[PDB]
Swiss-Prot record, chain A:
<feature type="glycosylation site" description="N-linked (GlcNAc...) (high mannose) asparagine; by host">
    <location>
        <position position="163"/>
    </location>
</feature>
<comment type="subunit">
    <text>Binds to host ACE2. RBD also interacts with the N-linked glycan on 'Asn-90' of ACE2. Cleavage of S generates a polybasic C-terminal sequence on S1 that binds to host Neuropilin-1 (NRP1) and Neuropilin-2 (NRP2) receptors. Interacts with host integrin alpha-5/beta-1 (ITGA5:ITGB1) and with ACE2 in complex with integrin alpha-5/beta-1 (ITGA5:ITGB1). May interact via cytoplasmic c-terminus with M protein. May interact (via N-terminus) with host bilirubin and biliverdin, thereby preventing antibody binding to the SARS-CoV-2 spike NTD via an allosteric mechanism.</text>
</comment>
<protein>
    <recommendedName>
        <fullName>Spike protein S1</fullName>
    </recommendedName>
</protein>
<feature type="glycosylation site" description="N-linked (GlcNAc...) (hybrid) asparagine; by host">
    <location>
        <position position="85"/>
    </location>
</feature>
<feature type="glycosylation site" description="N-linked (GlcNAc...) (complex) asparagine; by host">
    <location>
        <position position="107"/>
    </location>
</feature>
<feature type="disulfide bond">
    <location>
        <begin position="94"/>
        <end position="108"/>
    </location>
</feature>
<feature type="glycosylation site" description="N-linked (GlcNAc...) (complex) asparagine; by host">
    <location>
        <position position="194"/>
    </location>
</feature>
UniProtKB/Swiss-Prot annotation, chain D:
<comment type="function">
    <text>Subunit of the fusion protein that is processed upon entry into the host cell. Mediates fusion of the virion and cellular membranes by functioning as a class I viral fusion protein. Contains a viral fusion peptide that is unmasked after S2 cleavage. This cleavage can occur at the cell membrane by host TMPRSS2 or during endocytosis by host CSTL. In either case, this triggers an extensive and irreversible conformational change that leads to fusion of the viral envelope with the cellular cytoplasmic membrane, releasing viral genomic RNA into the host cell cytoplasm.</text>
</comment>
<feature type="glycosylation site" description="N-linked (GlcNAc...) (complex) asparagine; by host">
    <location>
        <position position="119"/>
    </location>
</feature>
<protein>
    <recommendedName>
        <fullName>Spike protein S2'</fullName>
    </recommendedName>
</protein>
<feature type="glycosylation site" description="N-linked (GlcNAc...) (hybrid) asparagine; by host">
    <location>
        <position position="95"/>
    </location>
</feature>
<feature type="disulfide bond">
    <location>
        <begin position="53"/>
        <end position="64"/>
    </location>
</feature>
Curated annotation (Swiss-Prot), chain E:
<feature type="region of interest" description="Disordered">
    <location>
        <begin position="224"/>
        <end position="246"/>
    </location>
</feature>
<feature type="glycosylation site" description="N-linked (GlcNAc...) (complex) asparagine; by host">
    <location>
        <position position="321"/>
    </location>
</feature>
<feature type="region of interest" description="Receptor-binding motif; binding to human ACE2">
    <location>
        <begin position="142"/>
        <end position="213"/>
    </location>
</feature>
<comment type="subunit">
    <text>Binds to host ACE2. RBD also interacts with the N-linked glycan on 'Asn-90' of ACE2. Cleavage of S generates a polybasic C-terminal sequence on S1 that binds to host Neuropilin-1 (NRP1) and Neuropilin-2 (NRP2) receptors. Interacts with host integrin alpha-5/beta-1 (ITGA5:ITGB1) and with ACE2 in complex with integrin alpha-5/beta-1 (ITGA5:ITGB1). May interact via cytoplasmic c-terminus with M protein. May interact (via N-terminus) with host bilirubin and biliverdin, thereby preventing antibody binding to the SARS-CoV-2 spike NTD via an allosteric mechanism.</text>
</comment>
<feature type="region of interest" description="Integrin-binding motif;">
    <location>
        <begin position="108"/>
        <end position="110"/>
    </location>
</feature>
<feature type="glycosylation site" description="N-linked (GlcNAc...) (complex) asparagine; by host">
    <location>
        <position position="36"/>
    </location>
</feature>
<feature type="region of interest" description="Disordered">
    <location>
        <begin position="160"/>
        <end position="195"/>
    </location>
</feature>
Amino acid sequence: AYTNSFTRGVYYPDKVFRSSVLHSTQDLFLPFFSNVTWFHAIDNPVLPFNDGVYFASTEKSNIIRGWIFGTTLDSKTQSLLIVNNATNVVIKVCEFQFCNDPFLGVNCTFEYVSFKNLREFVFKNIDGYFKIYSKHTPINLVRDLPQGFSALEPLVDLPIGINITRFQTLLALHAAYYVGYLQPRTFLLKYNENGTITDAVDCALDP
Amino acid sequence: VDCTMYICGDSTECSNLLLQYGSFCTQLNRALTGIAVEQDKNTQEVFA
Amino acid sequence: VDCTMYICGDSTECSNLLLQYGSFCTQLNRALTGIAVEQDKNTQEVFAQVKQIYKTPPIKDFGGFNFSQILPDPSKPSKRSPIEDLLFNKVTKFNGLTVLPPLLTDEMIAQYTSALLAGTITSGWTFGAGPALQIPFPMQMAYRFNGIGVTQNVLYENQKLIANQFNSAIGKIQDSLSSTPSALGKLQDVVNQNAQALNTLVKQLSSNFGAISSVLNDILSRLDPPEAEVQIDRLITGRLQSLQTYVTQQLIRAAEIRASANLAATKMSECVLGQSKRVDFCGKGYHLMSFPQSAPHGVVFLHVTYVPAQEKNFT
Amino acid sequence: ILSRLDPPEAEVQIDRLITGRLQSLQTYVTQQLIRAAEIRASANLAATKMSECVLGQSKRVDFCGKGYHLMSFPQSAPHGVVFLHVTYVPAQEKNFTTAPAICHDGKAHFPREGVFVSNGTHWFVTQRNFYEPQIITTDNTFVSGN
Amino acid sequence: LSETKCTLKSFTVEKGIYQTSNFRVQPTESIVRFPNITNLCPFGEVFNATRFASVYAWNRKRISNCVADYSVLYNSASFSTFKCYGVSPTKLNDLCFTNVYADSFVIRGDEVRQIAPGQTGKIADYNYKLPDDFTGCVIAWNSNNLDSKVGGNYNYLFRLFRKSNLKPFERDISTEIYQAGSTPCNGVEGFNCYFPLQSYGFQPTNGVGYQPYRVVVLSFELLHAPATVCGPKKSTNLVKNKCVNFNFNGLTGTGVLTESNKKFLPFQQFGRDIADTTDAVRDPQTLEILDITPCSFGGVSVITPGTNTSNQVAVLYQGVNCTEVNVFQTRAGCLIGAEHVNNSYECDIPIGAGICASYQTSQSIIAYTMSLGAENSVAYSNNSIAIPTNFTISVTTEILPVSMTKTS
């Protein structure tokens, strides 16, 4: 549908170890309170990203996991399909077939790679690095977007080197998932004494 | 004073070259703001 | 601040290339030392105005007036009045930076102020000129009243009413000072400004100053001679301009502090140790008497004035 | 330096020379302005002192000397000025006994200028700043109430 | 005493407290420490690879995740292009690169002052894509008579015909035309489609430069990472609370490997308290968190009476605990060469925090709360007054500056 994306899709710019400040960073993120072209996932069409995002997402029980990259998205050129489980990692960033009813089924060389639960996924390509970020935390609501916050932690950090420009969706099969519309703004992260991103404000939203 | 405008003059190259120096420009704005507030303080204190 | 350590970070090459500039570091150290001495001069000049140490008699019989809210309290480990305690509780390193401790401590400041207060209460205004001569309060207050053109029997016919008004006013001012949080904005602003300036003067290391990076340690482990010189000349320029925005704005700021300290010294000598005839100098109204108190990096005065209140027509 | 040097290598040194001359000299012209501010403050203070203490007599406590002011005389010095202050200081004290009023014929009598003191058996009236006793009459007292 | 005579530029010295050259904690053990990591990297299978395939399909062998000898990475005189900016060669040895990656491409004669990941070429911008920034260093040995082809090489092909400007280090195999007008020719020849890539003419009868230059380049990355990866220097044992050798992962000094209880929250391990210096370290072999802190330093000040009365001198270290250098510890530092006394007097030479000092063959170098004046008390009673009987006349003196000198 179209909903306020609330405060989803934030992550750690690096996997290093900080302490107890109020910082400001400049990178590619997901908006706050966005007019997402949220087309559903189960009623299962494509999403937006705008200015600098992976396939941002939302998730209930590992429901909204896979998506497609490429440039023409027909395997005729740069084209990428991602099945997603994050348990038995036999990497398939390989080249597969896609659809405009975008859904996921069951070569790529270099194995040097990067609502009852919260597991939002990430698929970027920065300087060859094919970064991915996951999540794990349970909640209770079932209908729509929880009014909450969370930060996405990386899995690995290693490069592969395959180019991508455009996108479709996939659906890792054995309702609602929210994305946003951005331009390259800056964020103001906040921390606790235990080291978890607790708050953030978008510097280009209102006065 | 419009700091970056005065120094550069609508030049992207000048902007990217300037971003290597720091917070001189914020310092200048801060000092001028302090002066501006002090003036009105003086006038009020004398007359009211 | 330490010039060589701050600019070079223990690098023999950096020091060798810096040695061919001159005496900039010497001038900077001289200026900072001058400011450091000036501060202690200020505090001593304001507060040390008496030669002996007086103290109050053990028995408090002042004719009805109650001074318990300003005289020292023996229960506390540090002898401070309740107003002083409220004031003190109200208000809230490695890159060559140092901070030196002051010469006079809070205990000595408290003792000086207590001596002033006991002296004035016991003997009036005669302990500033020569020797101390005692006198009772109803007579001393009759003198003060006569000082502003009111015949002296008016005090003797209204002693109890005057005492009651005095005590009520003291209670009210204690409560009002306790209540509002924006009383000490001047002191808070001074402290905030100093800390902010120092923070930026350290974060200019987090600035670049011609450098491709900021933190000088890694840039110094990075750069060649003919480019390291290009960086350090701008780094000393910025450190001189910033510590000398402090030196400039703070020879300016020491000018402001010196003006304030001179004004405080004059106010003490003329309102505490005597009675003033200058209009609106020591308070609004007709001046009677003043009491001092201390506070972190400052001083506080409490004035006492006399105000007419009911009018009738005549011919 | 000017004899030995070459142009695009001497440009850096002349630029440095103006920067450092105007920089040492800029804390120093800022310091000419700063020291001028300080000297101006002192000069204004001296002018006020002359006008208020040599051309008159002042009542402000501890502005011209320590004690009670009487007179002043100026002198001269290289780049300066010197003042001499004449003051007044009490010397020797003695205890007494006091009282606010006296009720002779049921009326209350207050002193006009001075205090009531008693050597032990008799009552006199003296001025406050110097001990000279006088007999007590209706010349120097006024009546007010019962 | 000789030091302060030098500082004042005279022989006679008045009474007071003067300052001399400061004391830094010179390394109790020398200025040396760098982390456990000691790896390195080979180059053989990329320099002898069968295909350094064409500029649009360049080959890359994984050369990274190692302690690259940045001294070797700059001390190598075989490096022809060393405008490897951001960092600088002659100090490259003292550096700590978190990673040194492996990409590659082929240079030309005019670009040797332009060669890096980020370099000059439509070669780049269509077989590559990123800005033109300088960081990339090239191996070169004598290649005068090795391998070359008369007439022109149709693999290393100067792409004078490219639709846009120059941007290096990506990959794209489309040998596509100049869009100087509006013609997409889909990589074919023609008129107004001039074959997009011409040949430099790498001929063996020609000069040395034409004959082959297989180039191995190295990228550079710096991270605030868990301080496990940095340059070489001897790593001491985790001797807590003892000032030992440390150049900790790049941070020089001499000091302590104090085990840290700090959980050290999760993404600026080069602990970025606003000073941006490491405050905790973990290591793959020593998983424990190790705090970081430099040892002491502070000024040295000399107190002395007049030089015409005696030649004894006391020395005070500012803000230094005594054990870390008669010894007497005060709140202002450590004082050496003094006698503590209990009777209080006035102040002569102010030291700090309420302490003063003086000379005895009258008083010792006293240390306690000062004496503010002679105690007094006024006999106060509710029916007693005091009155003077005699007077005296006094004369004082005041001095004031009025003017200044006059220059131009």
